[model samples]
Structure formats: C-alpha cells, structure tokens
Target chain A: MSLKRMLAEFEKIQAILMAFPHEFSDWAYCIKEARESFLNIIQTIAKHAKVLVCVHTNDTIGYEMLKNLPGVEIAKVDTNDTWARDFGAISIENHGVLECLDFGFNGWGLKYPSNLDNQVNFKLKSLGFLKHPLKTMPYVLEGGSIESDGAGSILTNTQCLLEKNRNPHLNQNGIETMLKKELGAKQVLWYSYGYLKGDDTDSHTDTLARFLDKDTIVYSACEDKNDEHYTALKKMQEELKTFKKLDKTPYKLIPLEIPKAIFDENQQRLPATYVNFLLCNDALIVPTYNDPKDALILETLKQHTPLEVIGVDCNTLIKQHGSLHCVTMQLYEG
Target chain B: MSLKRMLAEFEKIQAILMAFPHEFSDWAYCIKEARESFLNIIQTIAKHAKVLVCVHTNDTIGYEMLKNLPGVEIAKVDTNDTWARDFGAISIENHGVLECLDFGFNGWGLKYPSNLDNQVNFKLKSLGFLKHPLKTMPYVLEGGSIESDGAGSILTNTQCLLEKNRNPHLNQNGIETMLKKELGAKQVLWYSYGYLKGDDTDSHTDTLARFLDKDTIVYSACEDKNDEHYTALKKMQEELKTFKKLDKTPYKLIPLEIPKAIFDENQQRLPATYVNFLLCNDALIVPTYNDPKDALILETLKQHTPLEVIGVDCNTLIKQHGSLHCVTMQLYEG
Candidate 1:
C-alpha cells in the first residue's frame, strides 16, 4: 500500500462509527445530558451517512430509541466505556479489500475498561463487514493516537504512544515498523506535546493535528504564552519545521486557535479545545466552549475549508474530559 | 361526553405512549437489553403510529439516541418510576376533542416514588399535546384499571378499586360516578378477583379480563383447583353468569389458561400473567413466560382472532412483579 492508495481509500466513506454516550465516561456531566448529546449526534450523522452505533444494552430504552433511528445500524458492543476512537477498530482498505486493524487499547492505559472496546472489532468482523481472516498490530494504538492525511503522511504524539503505560516493550522504531506494515504508511510525523489541562487520554491527535488535504495540516496553537500548552506547542512547531513528506516537500502548518477555558459548577477546569472537531464530508463539527473565542475559531477554519463549520457546545462534553473528535470515528468506503 | 361519543373518539388513535426501560426500575436485569427492548418497541410503533417516547433526560445518551429515531417524537418527562401504563395520562377523544385524564397512581399503593409519574399528565398538557381545560379525576385510577369494550361497558377488578391504600375516600358508587363522568362509561362490570401470583397492583383488569370486542372478553381462569386464585376466580365466574348486556343477553366469556407459577432463583414468586397483553390495531401482543404452556396460550389466542397473535417472552418482565401488560397501555381510538 502506498500513500496514494490510502488517499483513495478515504474517499469511500459512507458512514462513521460513533459510540453512544454512556454515563460512565468522565466527559458526560450527567447521564441525561450525555444521552441528549449522543442522540443529537446520531440523528445528525444518520441524516448524512449510515451510522454504526455502539451502545451498551443496559440502557434498554435508550438502546431501543437508537435502534429506531433511520439509516443507523447498531452493534451491541459490551463496553464499560463509550469512546470508540480509543477502542474502536480502525478499518483500512487494502487495494479495494476491507480489513480491520486491531490496535491495542488499554482503556487509555488501564484507567478504564478496554476489554469490551477491544472486542468491538471482532464483533464487527463477525458481522461480515470486513474479510473473514482478520489481522492485529502488536503495538498499542488508539484511533485518536494517529491521524493520516489518507496519503503517506501520519500524525501522532510522542507523549501518548511512547508512554510507559501504552507499549513499553516497543520503542519508537518498533512502533513505526508496525505502522508501516499494518497501515502501509511511508512517513510518520511525530508531535512532542500532549494535551492541555483536562484531557484524560494523554493527548489525542484530534486535539492537536488534523489533515485537511495531502499537503495541508491544521495544528492547535496557543496564543497566550502564560498558558501551559504554549511552550510545548512551540516545541512541536520546531519539530514540524524539520519534517518532510515522502515527496520531500515541507508540510504546511496551519495554526488553529484554542477555545475559551471552561469549568464546571465546582469551578474545576475542563479540557476544551477547538481542534477536537469532527470532519464530515461537508462539515467540520467543532466543539465550542461558550467562550468568546468560539466564533473566531470557527471563522479561522471557515477560511481554509469549503465545508461548513458546525459549532457544538463543549460545556457538557468537556466535563467528561473529551469533546467532538473523542467520541467520533470516520467510516470510509473502500 | 356521552359513551357513544367517547367510543367514536377512541377510533382515531395514531400512536401510543410508552417509557424507556432503565435501571431505575427494579425489573431491569440487563440495562442494555432493556434499552434495546424499549427502542425496538418505539421503532415498531413508529412504523404504524407516531410514537411519543417519554424518557428521563438524566440518561442523556439514551434520550439523545431516541431523538434520532425516525418518525418518533421525544419528550423529556421526569419519572422516578418507568411504568407509563399506570402513571401516564390516558388521552381520550370526544367528537375530535382531546382531553387528558390524570389517573391517580400511588406507585402500586404508595410503595414507590410516583411524584414524577403523577406530574406526567400535567407535563403532557404543558407540551400542548393534551387539549386545554383537561379533566383531572381525583380518585385512584390507572389506564389498566379499566378495560373498555369500545362501547358502553368497562371491566375492572374490585381488588384494585377497593384497595384502601388507593382511594379510601371513594366507595364503589363514588368510583363508578367518576368513571362514568370522566371515561364516559355507561356500565362498570366489577370482577372480584386478584392476580394469580405475586402481582403488587392487585388484579388489574388487564390481568383478569380483556375485551376482545363489544360483547366478548377473554378472562384468565386457573386450571388447578389447588391454586390460590382458583376459588376467587370461580366466584367471579359465578357473578359473571348473573350479569347481562343491554340486549338482555349473557356476555360471551372465553377462559384462558393460567400459566404455571414462576419463581426466581430465590423462590420469590414472579408475576407471569397472560392477560397483560397489548392489543395493536391488527395484532394481539401476548406475554409468554417461556413455559411449556407458552405455545398452548398462543394457540388459544389464535382461536379467537383472525389477526396475528404474537407472544413476547416476559421472563425479564416477570422479575419486576409484572409482565407485558404491566409495561404497555393502549391509546384507544375506536
């Protein structure tokens, strides 16, 4: 598989994988608000693309309600956690053939239950969405851990993938070998920084970097030097300056703004970021923290992409330590 | 409203009201399975009628998923208890006029927190579904308390209506007066019998007798004389022999078999009655206990109606002291 092949694979997306919000996730403020957000997102997605919704059956009424949604298919994945980006299988097309890559997910390193999420890929395979014979990668990897330009370029953070809790046995070279062989990527671009104040999954790439196209990349940057993320992101910029694509061209670095800081009723800080937005075919669903910066951030993204910028409030989602991208996984057609 | 007018109004039902299954209800064994069941029913109903699903917003993801269901409307109703049949408002139409009747539900005789269920009718009225100037019946009544023949007759159980915990202020005559005025019932046929097993709501008419038509009723009859319900049901049958319709002819009564006693692992008796089935416009949704008698009961129901007779396994429902009828209510539209 080459960079051009991966790009072609991404163009076939017919639907996306979304985990129905659950009460156990730290991001959900209360079970009610979490359900509302989940249903709202599922309804919105069902309108545009087919949805493979993952949900726990304990919520009988909620599950039944979701099953009733049009164009949404359900697979009851027994998960204590609902964040599919961390536990869901990353489906890739191998020369027009569909295969699921079983990446390691340890509940963001034993912080939550990953057993059910780990089995979700097997469930999907059993449903006949992918080929009969399945494959697995030895290294620990979450869907949020890496972002591909759908070409040869892959973006990831060193803080999470290289962390001791993730895959201690595998060094950077070892991890890259698995990525090249399994995902068939020619280049891996690493960002040195983790998350801002309240992220629980170390730092998901969705909160830091996104691939707008083959040559263009959107990176989250902090304007305030006093903020904790500023210096770390500055270091990431230094690292990106020396990086090159497979074609030896320097990657275009587009800086996106951080949303306003958000806190709960207890005044506890929340993990609020604009980069945690979802990229649908026609819209970029961005998380807004009800801060004054929300409008400005939307405007900035609007200047670069032809797609609509949808702003979703992160007040409730951030309470659980994640936002839009944390709960969503794109489903590409082969 | 006259009974004739009420019967005419009952013929235009477009949908039914139901609550989502949740852990808050003690009968929930698998919350996920319960949610699936709730969603399946909502979708099924939406295919025929517009479904108004009441859910607790506290379960945000669950509620949100429901909103995405096609052709179904979502209403956030606060409920400490999930049994909508007993607590939900019974919408009755008279000459195209809709009025919500607040049935006094004390959580099966002040046993559960029914404060939220009690407010459901007012909430529906507030949502503009119920016509303004609604009628509130002060006496204790549930939708299951009365089974209409879609004519002038209603069937009820003395055990429930006469229970001191429900309505000590209203005697049999007073109860009948309220029923006649509110439900527009010309005749109240009382059956003096209790449920076969450990049902807590006494013998709701749904468990004892169901009107198949204006002159026909299928009543649950105990086969074994040793069973506790045998003598009580026998006495009720003797009473039925003395009653006649306005045509001065004896009513047609069909005796349906009582299911064998079902006990949980702890040997606690479970509520597994066949009479608690839901009647769709063209189908009779009967509750089957998965016992050997399940097939026989289905056969028996098939003998009376040409419509499809479907049996739903009530193993999960029996654990909560009720079966299918306990979870469902009919929206009578002639």
Candidate 2:
C-alpha cells in the first residue's frame, strides 16, 4: 500500500469487473430476474468502457449471452456467488504503476459458502488479466460499502463497515485509520441509517449514496411519507445535510427518489434505489426498477452529472436484493 | 359600536363584495386586463356564494359588464380604487343581526386619492344593501391586512399593521388589546417579514400568507437564493417555524411558490403568487399568472383543503400590484 494509490470515483475509468450468474440460479425465486438484469447492465456498460465478465469454467449460457457484445471480454473462472463488488480486485496506482488490491472475503461474515468465490483474484492473475501485481491483504472491505471522491476523501455507511462479521479486530477508529493508511483517505463521511428491508448486504452505501464529484453528492431520498423507509431515510437525509466538504462548505445534494417498493414472491420489499448508478467514461448506467421514478431520476442525473445517463431495467435483479452497482466494480485507467 | 360585531373569515359566508374597473383603465398599460380579471373573479364567486358587485354610479360600461352574469347582485356605490379589500365594509353582528363597519381607509397610507372609496360603507348603507346601521369607526384598517382563523385568533403582519400611516397611535400591545375587544380576537400571531417587491402596502398578509386551518398557515416561499426576495423571505420562513398554536404546537406553514419574475409589456416584474387565492364556499378561485408552479400548487392544495380549486388568469391584475384576493372581500354569515 502507498499514499499515492488514491483516485476519486469521478476519475477516468478504464475497464469494469463484472460476474455472470452461475450459482445465483439456485435461489429459484429471482434466477430469471438476476440474469436478465445482469445482461441488460453489461450491454449498457460495454458501450462506454471495457467490460471484463467473470464466469465459471462450465458456464455455457453466461458465455453465449455476452459473446456478441462490443468491448466485452469473458474470463472463465470458478465462483460460488455473483457479487463481484465483494470479490473483485480494487484498482489502485503507485508512482504511475497500475495495481489492484485483493481484499479478504468471508461470504459477508461467513453467512454464505464463498470458498470458491474467495479465489477469484488468483484465477484472474493465472489468466494474465490484471495489468499489475495483486497484493492480497487480510482486511475485509466491500466495494459497495466504500465510496471515493476520486481525489482524497472517502464516504461509507457506519453499519456496514462496523459489522462484527467483517472486522471484529478493528473498531470504528481502527478501521478509519487503516483506510487512511491503506487507501489514503483524507476525509471520511460516515452515514449511519437508511437500511432497506430485504437487503442481505448489511446496508451498503452504494444503495443509499453516490458521489458525482468532490462537491456534489446524489443520494436516495424517500419523499413519500407513507413509505416504511421514510422515517429512517429522512433521518439519513438530515445527516447528509450536516456533512461538509474538506473546505468546510455544504455539499450540493441532489436526491434521487427511492423507487416504489418492489417485492419478491414473499412480498419482502427489495433494496431498490437510483443511487447505485455506475459512472462510465461516455455514459452512466442507472438501474431502473420499472417504476415511474425511473424517468424522474434519469432526468435529474442528466442535469447534474457529467456523464449522459441511461437506464437499464433491473426489475429481476431487485428480487434478489442486489443492484447493478453490486454486480460490477470500476477499474480506473492509468 | 356594540361588542357583538365580529366574524372570522373561515366561517360561513352569505355573500362576497367585489368591484368593477372604470378609472383603473386610465393606467393605459392594461385597460382591458383590469376589466377582464374582475369579470372572471366575480363569475367564480357567484358559483359558490352570493356575489355583491360594487360599481361606480353613472358608469355605463361597469353596469353593462354585470347585467348578464348569474347569481350576481349589483350594488351601485362610488369608489375611487378597485381594491375593495382596502375600502369595503367589514361585516359583523350586533344581537345576531348583520352589521357593517365603516373603518377609515386612507388610500393605503395616503398614497392615492380616496375621497370616494373611504365612504363606500356609508354608501352601501344608503342603498339599503346593509340592513343594520353602519358603525363607522375612527380606527384605520384594511381587510387585506388581517386574517381570522374563524375561532378567536388573528394572524397579520407587523409591517402593514404597524405602519405609521395606519396605526402609529397604537403600538404593538395597544393594537393587540384594541383588536381583541373590537374584533373578538383572543390571540394574535404577528409575522414580522415576507414583503414582496412592487408591493406598495408594505407586505399585506394576504399577499404573503393565508389560513388553511386554525393551526395551519400557508404562505409564500422563495426557493431560489438567486432571487432578490430570497433573503427576506428566508428569514420570514424561519420565523414561521417558531410560531405555536394555542395548544403549543407549531403552526404548519404550507408555502406557495414565489413565481418567476413576471414582466409586463414594458418589462416591470409583477407581484404574482398563489397565496392571493379567494376561498369561496363553492370553489377556491386561485390567481394563476400561468407559471409552471401553478399546476403544483393546485395539486398540493387539493390534498390539503376540501374546496375545489379553480384557476383564473390574473396576469393583468399584477400590473397594478394586486390580484384576486386583493380585489374581492368576503361577507361572513350571521
């Protein structure tokens, strides 16, 4: 780890790390939803940047689905789950050398069988996929929970980072100190509430907030008072208001309306939000929940962010309690 | 006058007092506008309640304007200004009998010639439109400056009520005591700010605020900080947050949109807002200057009030720095 490894989320993205659905079909309830959403998401990303799709060696359907997409490459590797945001390498730099950090994965505190998923980095290295050397570390961090300003600051959710399953050895101060030393975080904005009902990822910040630039933050806001998520999300919005930039001025907040609650077969409300947009060099891939708020969010993002926003219908992915941002990770250009 | 003569604005109304334009056409910039706006306003009032149209005697055009409307009664009276809200008789009760008060109107702080408008009350009594005796008071007041909750409280602005021209002889406490006894007011909520540009009345409460319920006050709000009215309106909004009802709960302030700067043919910005709405028993006549926020306020007030909101074009009335609420006066039921 070096102090020069930090880059903001708004910086230039070279390629993206994504995973295909192989073992997620076992869930039965959202197998079709997760797959269809993943397909639409990858096609959108391929138009803007290089897409590196990871799949199991025996996955024939996943390979055929993406074979004709432009700028899309498939990497046949073994995997037990499909949350690439938790398994993929985090891209970094050192004196102009491109590198990716392989953080430890324990199936989100050993809740799932991630034994094969944990070895995804080694597979990428064996195939000569990563440009630089992989430095596997013992720290447990997920890309969905941490957000960077592409310069020096980091923002994340307190509940996700402080989960006992991820880092019992480190307290809040300890984890923050490690992030500052390892990722070179200059400012860290930790928001505490706004967890969804059916979320299994422990309140990922990507589902709630995104940084468009050093001065702008677009977050998920529940404007409908009748929603069960209204109270906590309203409190979370108040917290976002109190946040100041490194220069001590208020951040420009553009709120993306929380999509109307989408439920699974059991009627559990899924974690659907517009904040989980993936920023690409030429465009932004926003996850749509087949709600009218999709048009509203798309218009607001187009007016605010630098990239042109495009919506990819993810009605099926929401049924599995994950979003487009969860299945893909950004790899910055050198 | 006996102490039984007082009625709240929100209570039942038997009739409404309105005026027609004759000399106001001399403004030349909008000879047809002031005429057309008054025509639409009285027609709306006639649908829900009794409409008493006040016209200057010996005016053939004013007489011809009303002879065709339904449920509208014409009361021929001499008037200098069309702002009946500043000069018309305020209805009251004495021993359960309808009485009218002839409060001294000084042409809005002696700014214009009002030798005829001030005697409008005594003229209405002379025509036998007012059955009870007219108790002409020495105290100066305008109908636009005071708002009644229909119970016992009054909400008005400090700027207009305490203007040296209106009531410099009565200080804050002095006026409070006089209004309590004179108008049967038990409590008075004085808002100190919310003055609009081109408002010669020094911020009439009707232009800035209104009572949706006894505890809820809807007013004008400027959301754009770039506006010149933003700073003063922001401070006024902050003051509204601190106001408490008789039950010690805060008054709910639903703000109307501060319209985009509307210019005349000569490019003078008009004082246009939705708060200057006429609440009729049959319908709420809202002045629409055809701003984008017109549809938004119509929908919001529909969810809040029981009245059917109807929009009337008042683009011309604002040229004279007044609108619908400033042109009509409600006569309360006995």
Candidate 3:
C-alpha cells in the first residue's frame, strides 16, 4: 500500500552511466577535443565512484581513451548521442528491492534521430552492466528532466514533461498520476516557468533547478533585466519559491549565479548554466564556461556542501546544447 | 561580518521556561484548572528535558505542586502572565558561541500589562537559572513571533512583526538589518497573511505555522470555505509556498487540519491551532481541544518526526486566548 522511493542524486550510488564521444555522432565536428573534455569529467567521477561508459565497439579510439581508467567499465554499445541522462536506466527502490525503469526516449521529441540511443538501455542491461531487474516503459521521461529528494517527492518542469511531442496523449493530471505510481512519488512539483535560449530539451529542470539535499535546492539565476532570459529565469526563480518539500516546508533555496552569456560562432546564446552540475559519491562536478562567475559559483557551492566540488570547463560541451548532468546519469546501489 | 544563526525550535535544548498561574493574573478565574493543564505539559516536558518553572513566593500551592517534580527547578519570581513564549530570551550562535538576546515584550503590542513580564528574563538570569550572559535590547519582539531554521533564515508574519504599536520608530528594513546583525539571519521570510479568532497576540506565527525541521513547515489549515478563517488560512498556506530555504528551495509544507470551532460562555470562538506544538528534547507537546482532528493531527506529526508527539488538553487554557506553546519557551543548552 506504500509508495516506492526514488534514489536522489546525492545518495549512495553504485555506478555512473556515461557514453564516449565518437566521430559517427554530432561529435564529428571535433571528436578529439570532445573526448578530452569528456575524459576530464569521467576521470573526476571515476576518482570517487564507479563509471559505466558506453562505447561503440568498432570505434577503437573511444575504447582506447577510456580504457585503463580507474573504476571504469566499458560497455560496448552504440548510441546516437552521448546524452546518457536521457537514455540511461532510472533506479527506484520498491519494497527494499532495486528496480530500473527504462523509459522511452525520442531524441528530445524527434528533434534528432534516436533509434540507437533508444536501445542503449536495453543494450547495457543485456551486457550485464546493470544488474537490477529492468522494466521498460513506453512513457517518455529523461533523468535530466526531473530531480528526486530520495523521498517520495519529484521536482520537474512542465515544459519538458508536457511537451506536445513527448507525451501528447497524457494531460498534466494524467502524467502526475503516472509519476506518482511509477516513480513512487507522493508529490510531483511542477514548474511551468523556465527556459534557456539554446536549450533543446524544452527547459529540462537539470539546467534550471536541482535538489542539493532532500530540502535544499540550488538553481540558475539571471540578474540582468535586459538579457533575453531575464524574464523567464526570474519568473522561474519566483516559481521555485512556490515549490514545497514533502514535509510542507519550503525548500532551502541557493541561487547559482548564471555565467555571462555564452555564444557559438553563429552568435546565438548557448544554454550554459551552473545548475547543470553532476553529483557523484564523494564529489560534485560542476560545468564551467571559463566565465568570471566560475570561481565565485564554485566557492558558493563549497559553502553549502561538504562534497569536494570540482569544476570542469564546459565551453565545448555547451556547444552541443548539453552540460555535465545532461551527459551523465547515476545508477543506484542495491 | 558573517551573520549569527538563530537556533531552531527542534534543535537540542537545555530547559523549557514556564510561569505558574497566580491569583494576580488572568488565571484567577480557574487557577486550579490552569495549573493542572500546565502540570501535564510541564510533566511531559520534564520526562525528557529540564523544566524551569517561575513561581510567586506567596503562592505556596504552586511551589508544592511543582517542587517535587523530577528535573524541575523553581524560580521564585513574579510575572503578569504565563506566556513565556513571548517574554523568554532568544538565543543565537555568533561565531559558534551561544549568546542570549533578551528582546522587550510589550504584551503583544501593549494589549495587556507587561511590566512584570518584561522583567522576568532579568529575574531568571539573576536567580542563576540561566548561566549564559544575557544582553537586553530595547527592541520589542516575541519568541512565538518568529520561526528560525538554525541556519541563517527566519520565518515570521508581518502582522506581528510590523504592528505599529510594537516598534513605531523602526521600519521593516530597519528591523531586517537588526535581525541580520543580532540574530545572524541571512534572510527574513515575511508572511502577510494568517489569523485566528480570539487570538490576542495579533496573529503570532506559532499559532499559524511552525517549522518541523529546517525546511519542513507544519501549519494550521481550515478546509471549510465558509468558515471565517478559511480565506486567511488558505492565503497563508499559499504564502508558505513562496518562502524558501537558505539554499533557495521551497519548503515542504504540511497542513494540520483545523479543528471544529470551540467557544466560551459568551459563544465567542477560541483560537485552537495544531501549529502551536512545543518541541522539547525528545518530545512534542501539542494542544488538544477535544476536537475530532486531534487524533489525526497527532498521528500525522508522529509520522513526520522521531520525537514522541503528545497532546495536552487545553480546554481551560484557551479561555485566556493562549495555548500550550504560548505558555512555554525553550532555552539553549550550554
């Protein structure tokens, strides 16, 4: 009669899921540089926890780069993109037993081809990388789109969860019902306000807000009223104030200063936010854009957390419309 | 300089403060009944934490009744009322050192005689019951008016904090600046709504909302839309959602069902709220009005806390417009 519990990002994790950048995917532009950036992040995570990396078997370059890394397990599998946060298995505890929910992923609502990415979870499970019993769900969900408190509460954005292409058949209430039953969430806190100009995932919550602990939330904040994102981000901050924790108390809020506007060669703003940080066993890996705010944000995070907070330069990663947390997912321990 | 931190009610404490009902006070109508109710609550708190009971030297009955109780220390002093929550000293940690701030209490904006109540703090400290050095301030404030998270955040209602009669010379900004310096509060969360009938403290927050933990708030909620308090309580609940933790996350909010209205001989409704529960060392004492919601609210509290939640009948105490928490205050342990 009781609901199951979702594992929080800061909880004890068995392994972190990541995919190697290769020439066949979007990394074809500068695969070597991307691999190096990915290496830095992977190595940082491997230092504190186990890593399960998906690499194309035929791509010897990808395998060679990740091999010999401490606590790294290579899974020979193919993926259309390196965003494991969208395609990896999501773990939950049901009656004290671990279960993996492999929800449907459609390349961010068919914006890109995901036939290979869609099968990566099944491939990983079949390769014995994930030992938990797996349950394949047709419902579209992304680990980047939601934040769990390790309790029965889930924080997500409606823009991503209710995008017309993601789940057209389910209304807001219907989706909430499914989340409650499937994710074992007693409450689903939905934010309708949040967006990054270049974000392709329809304002995924990982790039907007995140739970530091069961009751503390750190999010991206924009101060310039003249910026294009000022209105949306400010409204999102206010909306954040409206979200409550599972115990009927407001969540402790920490605003991660948004870095100066980052742009690609085309002069279009990239979705770079400090909110897209990854939490591992003993460290928190944050994305840095080489902006002046990087040092300040790092120090701010250090003040609130005991974990070893490290920053990985993400000037290259944001070019692909994803950051650290968007490219990786944490798997739960039994 | 960094701000000081006001200790949360749920934090470990040394002793609880209470004043015996005396003939010169409002309790003369039913001092015996009031003493019995206070005894139940004081005895409950004594079982787990130390109890400091202030008694009039002339009141032999009051001394004999409490003198033999375990862990009970009697302070032969004087007071205009039994509301220690308003006149007790407020504690804050400055640079990891405990400091007691004795703010002036003016009988809830000078609504009643507080000449004796204002001097109780000095008397207790003078009598050796309080070993910590006390700093008295001219500012008027009450312990029940504010809820601290033991971090750098304080939750309070504007109605009580801004009452013109309390401090006519200080504006909101002025008060906030003082709180930041004196109480070590980094953020002050102000609620503009919340009220209860027959409440004499101008809508004290303890009678409306309380923090169960740093980020969890439990409050009184009225479901009856037709009731006079429905609109105000509902608005207050919505306001709670807008209050964030120090980390910028919304607080988890739990609404305690409001009990059926209880009245006195004049048929005027009494203010009975579950939000006014007191947290001792290992127990929480809640006021019970013999309403049906009593059992349900107590069960709900037990599920959310490790502390034993007990209900004390407050049918007699409410006749004077105060409840369990209004009669007690917690002192920080050295």
Candidate 4:
C-alpha cells in the first residue's frame, strides 16, 4: 500500500480496548486501591473515546453500573490476566483492509496467566467487522515490547527481547526480520536498560520511552540518589545520547521523572512512573501516584507538549504490578 | 353548611358542559363558530384543572383530538341537546364530602331535547368516580338556569324559570324551596331580561351577568344604536340600579361592551359574548371569533383583571352555537 493510503486507513477507530486490572501480582497488599485505579482509568477513557472495556463478567457489577454513562460501551471478556497491551491483538490496515496481527504472548516471559488473554485476538476477529484474518507471529511479543513513531523506527528494551525465557529459538537478526515483515518497521532502536522495579514484564518501552513526534523521543529518568532506578536510568540516558538520526544530528531526549514512594499496606514497592501516561485524541492521561514529585513531573511534561494533561490517581493501579500504560491500548487515527 | 364550606365546594369541579345549538336553535348556522368558542375555553381550563369535557365525541374527531393536548381529559356523554347547564349535574361539597345534584331539565320551556341533556347527569353519576346515590331534584332546572357566587346568593333567569312549559307542577315558592334544599342555596336573585336575539335557552345570566366579587357584577351592554338588544338592556340597567344589597348599598355593575355582530353564511347570529370567558388559575381564557374585535375584547378584559388573558379562536364553536364561558367549569382551590 502507498504510504498515504496506509495513513488514511487509521481514521476508522471503532473502539479503544482497555483492560480492567483485578489481580495484584506484585504489590498485592492493597486490592481495593487497585480496583479504584482501574475504575478511574475506565471513566477517563469513556469520557474521551467510545471505549470497549474488558471486564470479567462474574464479578463486574461495578463496571456494569457504568453502562448508564453516555457514550461508553462494555465488553465482557473472560481473562485470568487483565493487561491487554501484552496479549491483545495489534490492529493494522493493509490497503484499506483491517487485520489483526496476533503475537504469541507468554505472560511477558511466562510469569503470569495468559491463557484467556491469548484467546482475545481470535474472539475479536470472530466479530466479523474486519476483512482480514489473524496472522500469527512466531516470536513472543507484547504490544509494549515495541514503540513505533508510526514512521519506521521501533524502540524496545534489550532486557525483554534478550531475556533467556523469550524467543530462545530466534537470534537478534531473526527477531528484527520478523518485526520488519509483520509490523512494517524499517529500523529497530535498542534501549540497553529497562524500567526499575517493574516485574512480570521487563521494562516495557511505554513505561520508559515514548515517541513524541517522528524524530523526537521522551524517556523516564530517575535523578534521586536513594532511588533504585537512578543508576540504571542514568546509564540508559548516556546510551540514548550516543544515538544519531539519519541527518547525523543527535536524537532529542526529553527526560520525565519516575514517580516516588508508592507502597501498599505491606510496604511492597509498586510500579509508578510519569512515562506510562496515555496519549488520547484531545488530551494526555497521566498516572498520579499521590507522590510529592507528581506535580513536578506533570509540569515538566506539560511544558514540552501542547496537549491537556489530566492526572489520574493510579496508586491503586500500582498495587496490581503495573501502571497506567499496562491497561490501555491505543486505537490510532493515522 | 357555613358560607365558607359552601364556597369551598367550587374546588371539586372536574369538568364543564355546554350545549351546541342545532338547526332548531336560533344560532344554528353559527355552530362552527360556537365550537371554536368552546375549544378556547376547554384549552384554558386544561391548564388549571383536569378537564372532563363532554362533547359529541362520536359525531366528530374534534373532541377526540382534544385528548391529545396535554392536561386534557375527556368523557364523551351522548346528548341530543348540548347545553350542559340544562342537563349537567351540579357538583356540591358538604364539609368536604362531594356529591352530584341531578336537577330536572325540561329544555327551556320544552323547546329542545331535554331528554338527552337530562340523561347526562345519570351517566356521570354511573361513571363510578363521582360517588353514587346522587341527589335528584324534582323541579325543572338547568346549569345555566342559575349562577352563584358560591356564597349565599344565587342568580337565575326569570323568563325560563317562570315560563309555562317548565315546572308546571310547582309554584314559585315550591321552586324556591327546592333550590334551597338541592343546591344548599340561601337566597335567589332574579334577572328579568336576556339577549334580544337569544333563543333556545332564553337569556342565561352567564352571558348577561357575572359576579366579580360578592356585591360586584360585570354585565354585557350593547352600544350599537341599530341593534335590537339596546333598548331591553337599558331597561335591565335601570332595574339593576334600583336593586339594593342587604347592607343598603347599591351593587357594583361594570358594563363590558357587547362584541360586534357575528353571523354565519345564513345570517344566523352567534352567541359570541366576551363575558363568558373561563377563569383559570393563572390565565383567563377568552373566546375570540375571527372578528376584528377579538383582540380588543382580550385587551379590555386584561385591563379589568390581574390574571393573564389568553384568547382562543371560537369561530368554529360559534358556528355550532355557543361561546367560551358556555362550556368551561372551573376547578378552584376554595
């Protein structure tokens, strides 16, 4: 397909997929907080888009009660895991025809239950709204494993792709070739380090790196001396500085702060960061963990972009071992 | 019952009734104008009370269509004659207890269908909402036969009551006794003159006189010199001057101008008096014939009353032979 035709095909976004996190895998102490975090995200999405939120029907009265709100649509998808970005189908249009590219998800390296999440792609395809069939990729890949500028460059954490549990049969070249053919990516950029304290999924690029424009990128940076993420993120920043664009100019690196001091009743550390914010059609939905640094991070991001920044409390979301970007998937207009 | 209790009985009025003039009636050709006159009244009454309008529902779609208007309720009672005053039941309340007094109607000296009009009361009593064991008065009576201030005084037309065709079995004393017993009325004041062109029901006090207060009445007067009603109405004015109240003061008489002559294709004069307007809680519904004088009448009435005045076209109703006040019954909170 011509580049213009491929770009025009992105306009028909029927529904945005959102996962309702119910189980607390890492920060399992505050389940109530986690549920509230999920509800806040769902309400925010419903206010902005025609949301197709996934909730387990068995215990979804809280979610079902939101049906009365105008413009929100719900879909009951049974799943043991709630993170859609890791297991949900990646939708793409080829020559004006819609298709789902199903990447094999092994619970971000087989650490969580994904049996139900894997079936979502086939189920969505069965709805008959799309013209193309589901194409399976051999490599274990999650949506967050790759961040595209919708141009050609793809960014990923070397820790996740180079992890021993994932894609042992494929080398770095094999993975690159498969990504080029399936995702239509022209170049792959590697981040040597991933996010700190993010378990179950080794530093998904969305929680550390985001593409602001075709050429510019923003990444998470931890400046505090006592924080666990500081040394590793600083080294990653140094690596990003060495990269150059096709014009031979250094790539723009905008640094965002890591959210500070979020903990459950049992005092377990939760995944919290400003980098996991969502880019919607009209506004940016950022996760606020009630940390003291939230204002600084929000203000810093607002200065660099023109979009309205809405801070949603995701303290409860962190108790479920994931942050804001884990539960949301974008339905992009080209 | 005390005077206060008697006046309070005005609150239970659920519906109003009126008779439509036929070919035998003097205003037969103006039936369409008369019907329009009644529509204006009904629409006004609907705003303040739930109107149970008894119309010739089977013969025309007019009554049926009125039910579609908000706040209007309908009760179609078959009547060979349409004058509800002649056959309609007098609703009474004794210390908050509601009852219907069915007065015998002989059609204003046996000139019209008294049988059909008289049956209207029985039908209303049997409708079940109006409590059973309705009181029946043996003397000849009609709703228009008497007008009341809901206090001690009752007004009636002397020509119809004293006519030989009506109440042949009773004298004036007997009639007075029946009125006191059936209507709980203490005094009966009599009017001797009616419209010169008026036929069918004689000169009903409703068109000629209306009580604005306890000792104040507004009477209709014709200034037109060539009109036949001028001389008789002048004599009636003289009679009104001679009459004194119990306190020895003269009764207040406010004269409203008689509407210009309204006639049908056959030159049959319609009963299009402005005095017969219905009084709603917030608005006074006045009948307007498609004459140029309609707006003038509404403005004049507005100057005299504090309430909002709404004019409804009575052109169609006047053709059927009645004007605004002829059809409406007020449901007041006494």
TM per model?
0.49, 0.49, 0.50, 0.46
A best-first ranking of the candidates according to their lDDT comes to 3, 2, 1, 4
Model 3 / residue A220 / CA error / Å: 1.0
**What DockQ score does model 3 reach against the true complex?**
0.00
User: What are the C-alpha RMSDs, in order, of all predicted structures?
Assistant: 24.5, 27.0, 26.0, 33.2
For model 3, give the TM-score of chain B: 0.97
TM-score of chain A of 4: 0.88
Write one digit per residue (lDDT tens) for candidate 2, span B74-170. 9888666688888877766665777777776766654555656776777777888776667766566898888887666688889988775555446
lDDT per residue as tens, model 4, B166-254: 55335677777666766676777776865736345667777777765567766778888788788878877776676555567778887
lDDT of 1 at B76: 78
Model 3: residues with Cα > 4 Å off, grouped in runs: B1-334
Q: List iRMS for all predictions.
A: 25.7, 39.4, 31.8, 48.2
Worst 10 residues of 3 chain A by lDDT: A106-115
DockQ of 4: 0.00
Give me candidate 3's interface root-mean-square deviation: 31.8
For model 4, the superposed segments whose C-alpha errors exceed 4 Å read A1-14, A21-32, A128-133, A332-334, B1-334
B-chain TM-score, every candidate?
0.89, 0.94, 0.97, 0.82
What Cα-based lDDT does every candidate model obtain?
0.70, 0.77, 0.85, 0.64
**Residue A198 error, candidate 1, Å:** 1.1
Q: Taking the candidates in order, what DockQ does each have?
A: 0.01, 0.00, 0.00, 0.00
